[PDB]
Design a protein around this ligand. Structure first.
Ligand SMILES: *C/C=C/c1ccc([N+](=O)[O-])cc1
Length: 243
């Protein structure tokens, strides 16, 4: 049932694209069939987004942002400072980029320490931390699993495929691998999964949700455990739903 999956996917979106653009994003998040789970903006845009969401009567739409982004550099102090600033701006959620090049160079420890430091900041402010591992740069299945594992161990609240800023973003395969790690680690209660990119259409979204359904059961993928972001996806979902 494409309509049923499209509605579910819509309510799982972190919708992402000046003040005019932020304000328009917020408006777009309030759709005729429901609200997206969140909007995603740069940290500096959080205050104006919060005001806009409030003014339009959608205060429960979450505000997510990005730090250590999009590079995934291995400077913990910079990543942490950015994350504290995101929090101070008013983020509900911070999507931090894992130091994936460092892991490809054999340094697992800095990924652990970077995620942990950011998680600690987030948790003290009741902010969720997503960790972007950049599956499209890691490429290798074992590296995708290791990055996922290190992120979970360090306290990620979500593991996320991609920044959306490299040539290769989510695929069904990388999504499967990452959700298999959640399952294999036994952390499906505490750790969500987010697809970024590779999900252009309603039909695509249905497939991604089906993976989660098959691994965890059909009730698992609520907004605390599953999110989507991709250019064009909202329009495709709305079209499936007749808008
Ligand atoms: C995973 C989040 C990616 C992303 C890209 C761009 C923006 N933005 O335009 O604010 C937010 C989040």
């Amino acid at each position: 049932d494409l309509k049923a999956s499209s509605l579910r996917a819509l309510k799982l979106m972190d919708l992402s694209t000046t003040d005019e653009k932020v304000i328009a994003l917020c408006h777009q998040a309030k759709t005729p069939v429901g609200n997206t789970a969140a909007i995603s903006v740069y940290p500096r845009s959080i205050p104006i987004a919060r005001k806009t969401l409030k003014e339009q009567g959608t205060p429960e739409i979450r505000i997510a942002t990005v730090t250590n982004f999009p590079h995934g550099n291995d400077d913990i102090e910079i990543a942490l400072a950015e994350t504290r600033a995101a929090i101070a701006y008013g983020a509900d959620e911070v999507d931090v980029v894992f130091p994936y090049r460092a892991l490809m160079a054999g340094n697992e420890q800095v990924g652990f320490d970077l995620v942990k430091a950011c998680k600690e900041a987030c948790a003290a402010a009741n902010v969720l931390l997503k960790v972007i591992i950049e599956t499209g740069e890691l490429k290798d299945e074992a590296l995708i699993r290791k990055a996922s594992e290190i992120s979970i161990k360090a306290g990620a609240d979500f593991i996320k495929t991609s920044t959306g800023r490299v040539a290769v973003n989510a695929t069904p395969e990388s999504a499967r691998i990452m959700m298999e790690v959640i399952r294999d680690m036994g952390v499906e209660k505490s750790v969500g999964f987010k697809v970024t990119g590779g999900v252009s259409t309603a039909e695509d979204a249905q497939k991604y949700l089906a993976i989660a359904d098959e691994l965890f059961g059909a009730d698992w993928a609520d907004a605390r455990h599953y999110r989507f972001s991709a250019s064009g996806l909202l329009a495709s979902l709305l079209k499936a739903l007749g808008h």
